[PDB]
Design an enzyme around this catalytic site. Structure first.
Site, PDB file in Angstrom:
ATOM      1  N   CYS A 172      51.409 -40.363 -34.012  1.00  0.00           N
ATOM      2  CA  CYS A 172      51.063 -38.955 -34.328  1.00  0.00           C
ATOM      3  C   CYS A 172      51.740 -38.593 -35.654  1.00  0.00           C
ATOM      4  O   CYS A 172      52.277 -39.445 -36.336  1.00  0.00           O
ATOM      5  CB  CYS A 172      51.382 -38.063 -33.109  1.00  0.00           C
ATOM      6  SG  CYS A 172      53.153 -37.882 -32.739  1.00  0.00           S
ATOM      7  N   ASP A 228      47.537 -31.425 -31.327  1.00  0.00           N
ATOM      8  CA  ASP A 228      48.934 -31.240 -31.509  1.00  0.00           C
ATOM      9  C   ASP A 228      49.393 -30.007 -30.755  1.00  0.00           C
ATOM     10  O   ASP A 228      48.866 -28.913 -30.972  1.00  0.00           O
ATOM     11  CB  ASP A 228      49.229 -31.076 -33.001  1.00  0.00           C
ATOM     12  CG  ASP A 228      50.690 -31.091 -33.304  1.00  0.00           C
ATOM     13  OD1 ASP A 228      51.610 -31.205 -32.471  1.00  0.00           O
ATOM     14  OD2 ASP A 228      50.977 -31.036 -34.521  1.00  0.00           O
TER      15      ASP A 228
END
Length: 152
Positions: free
Chosen positions: A8, A125
């Site tokens: 990520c 996110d």
């Protein structure tokens, strides 16, 4: 050995959860000796930080130990991992960029959500979200990780 790297932007919210999810699955199926599992960040903002405490609270509610030091992806990771599974399109963009700067790209670079039987392609996110957004991410990680493990 098979290997997977979860990625990520910061390596403090989504990829540590996916990594701990996946490690659980493999450990519970007696095959963690066969898997190298890790997580890493496309960016340098969070290097040396533990997972976001919100994610730790989530994973503690689900019974999952989670223990990680944030780190940035490296050129070597492209050579060594079989899979690099990321969370969103900006991750994918950045990873494709980096992959094109190395000599050896062994890794298949894919969104983790491409594995979801429920078809939620993007693992959003949760940084600017709340506890329910951590829980969604955990549930996505659990579905996608189990599909990935079955296919890999």
């Amino acid at each position: 050995t098979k290997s997977v790297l979860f990625v990520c932007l910061g390596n403090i919210c989504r990829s540590p959860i996916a990594e701990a999810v996946f490690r659980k699955l493999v450990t519970d199926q007696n095959i963690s000796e066969n898997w190298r599992v890790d997580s890493a960040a496309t960016s340098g903002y969070e290097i040396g930080n533990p997972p976001d405490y919100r994610g730790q609270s989530c994973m503690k509610r689900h019974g999952i130990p989670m223990s990680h030091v944030a780190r940035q992806i490296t050129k070597e990771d492209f050579a060594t991992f079989d899979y690099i599974l990321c969370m969103d399109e900006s991750n994918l963009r950045d990873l494709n960029r980096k992959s094109n700067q190395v000599k050896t790209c062994k890794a298949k670079i894919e969104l983790l959500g491409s594995y979801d039987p429920q078809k939620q392609l993007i693992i959003e996110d949760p940084y600017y979200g709340n506890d329910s957004d951590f829980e969604t991410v955990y549930q996505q990680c659990v579905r996608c990780c189990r599909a990935f493990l079955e296919k890999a």
